[PDB]
Design a binder for this molecule. Sequence first.
Ligand SMILES: CC(=O)N[C@H]1[C@H](O[C@H]2[C@@H](O)[C@@H](NC(C)=O)[C@H](O[C@H]3[C@H](O)[C@H]4N=C(N(C)C)O[C@H]4[C@@H]3CO)O[C@@H]2CO)O[C@H](CO)[C@@H](O)[C@H]1O
Length: 540
Amino acid sequence: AAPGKPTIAWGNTKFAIVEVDQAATAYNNLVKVKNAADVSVSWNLWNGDTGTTAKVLLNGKEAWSGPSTGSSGTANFKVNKGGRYQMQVALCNADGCTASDATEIVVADTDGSHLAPLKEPLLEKNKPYKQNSGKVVGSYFVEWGVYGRNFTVDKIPAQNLTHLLYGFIPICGGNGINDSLKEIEGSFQALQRSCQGREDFKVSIHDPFAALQKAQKGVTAWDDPYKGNFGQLMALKQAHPDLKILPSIGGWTLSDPFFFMGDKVKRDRFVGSVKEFLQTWKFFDGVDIDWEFPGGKGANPNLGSPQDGETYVLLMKELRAMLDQLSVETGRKYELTSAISAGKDKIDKVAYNVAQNSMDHIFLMSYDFYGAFDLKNLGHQTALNAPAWKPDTAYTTVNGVNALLAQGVKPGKIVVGTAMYGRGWTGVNGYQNNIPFTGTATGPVKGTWENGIVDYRQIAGQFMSGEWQYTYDATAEAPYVFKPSTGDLITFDDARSVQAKGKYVLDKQLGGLFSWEIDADNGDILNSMNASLGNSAGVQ
Ligand SMILES: CC(=O)N[C@H]1[C@H](O[C@H]2[C@@H](O)[C@@H](NC(C)=O)[C@H](O[C@H]3[C@H](O)[C@H]4N=C(N(C)C)O[C@H]4[C@@H]3CO)O[C@@H]2CO)O[C@H](CO)[C@@H](O)[C@H]1O
C-alpha cells in the first residue's frame, strides 16, 4: 500500500533571499544578498508505512528528495525565486505517493514578491487621477520624515505619481568628505556608523532603522525581513508596478563626495556601489543624482572646481552604461535622472546638451530662488516669471528652462519643479506700494521643522486666516501671504501657480512636473500638478 500521509512539522515558514541581520548597525553587516533562500521543512508520520522516498514539493514541483528512513525527517534546500508557495511533503514507495496537506511558505526578496500590495486610501485633500497625460508627475519622499513628521510610505498618494523618489542615499566618507553633514546634530556620526568597515565613496543607507527596521503598515510582523520605508516601498511596487521608484543620492548636505569624483578611481567605486545597491534592492528602478552643485556654491564653501562639469558628464555617461548593462541582464528598463539648479549661473557650468543623451529626465529645481538665507533682497521663491516691480529678476522658472533650451537640451527632458513648502522672513519693513518684496527683513519666518521654511499644509492650515493678507501675483504666477503686524512674509506655490506651471509645460512641450517634498502637501499641490498636465480624474 502507498505510505501514510505525513504531517508537516510546526516550524518557521518565513525565509529570505536577501537576509537582514537584526543586530547590525553597519550597512555591510545589515544586508546579505544570497543567490537563493535557505528553506527547511520537517515532517512526522503519525500512522502507517513511512515510504522509501520523501520529497518536498512547492506548488507540486520537487524542491528536495531523499530516502525516507523513519517516522520523522528534515529537509534543507534552496529556493531562488521570491513569492508564496504551497509546500507539501510527499512520501512515496513503489505502490504510490501520499502528499501532506499544504503549508504556505514565504520566500522574501527585495522586489516585494512576497508582500501583499500596499494599496491605501487617499488621505487629506488628495483626489484620484489617472496617469494618462504621458507627462512626468514626480515627488520626493524623505527617509527622515517618519518620526516627528509622521509621514510614512502608506500616506503617499501613490496612484497620483509617475515617479516617486527617495531622499537621500548617502555616499560613505568621514572628515573632508561629508563635512556638510556636521551641521545636522548626530548626522555625520550616524553616517560613519552606517559606513563602518565600508570604503569611502560607496553608497550606504543613512538611517537603517527608518529604512529597513521600523514597524510600518503591512510590515509589522517580527519576522518580516524588510520593514521601514524599504519594506513599504516594495509592497507599493506590488500595488503599482508601473510606478518608477528611484533612489536619490546627494541633496544639500550629502553632496560633498561628488566633488572628489574627478578621480576616476573614486568615480568607478561609486558607480559600482550603485550597481550593487540596485542589485540588492530590486524595487528601485534606476538612480537620481542630486549633486549640489557642480562648480560649488552648495553647502560647503571649500568645494567646487572648474572641472566639475566634465566630471558630471562623465558620471552620467558611466551611470548610463552601468544601467544599460543592468537593464539587459534583467530585462527591465532603468532610469537615470538628476535634480539640478535652475539658476543660469549654475546651469552653464554643465553641458547638459551632452549629458542629456544619458538621462531620462532632468528635474529642474525651479524653487529656492529667494529665502531667509538672504534678508535684504526679497522675491518669489518659485515663480514662473519675473514680477512687475523687477522684470529683470534673474532667478525665475522660465529663465532656468530657457538656459537649458539655449544649450540645446530637448524640451521633453526638462521636468519643471513645484514647491510643496514656502520660504519666508519675519520683520519685513521699508517696502513701497504695498509690495512687501521691495522691503528688507530682520530674520527668518518661524518654520514648521526648521527656520525660514514652512510646509504648504501649514500655510493653508494656519496662514490663510486672521490677519494674513493673501495675494496672487498674476505677472510672476506666484502666491504670497503677508502678516503686516509682525512683517511675516511667506512665498509659496499654490494650486493656481502650479496650474500655471503645468499649462506652461504643456505649451512648451516640456516633460512634466515634480515636487519637493511629498509629506508637506495637503493634496492641493499634487492635485493641481495632475489636473494641469491634463491627467484624467478617476482611477485605472
Ligand atoms: C539628510 C539631512 O541633512 N536631513 C536634514 C534636513 O535637511 C533637509 C531639509 O533642509 C530640506 N529643506 C526643505 C525645504 O525641505 C532640504 O531640501 C532640499 C534638498 O536637499 C534639495 N534636493 C532637491 N531635490 C529635488 C532632489 O530639492 C532640494 C530641496 C529643497 O530646497 O534637504 C535637506 C537635506 O539635503 O533638515 C531637517 C531639519 O528640517 C534635519 O532634521 C535633517 O533631517
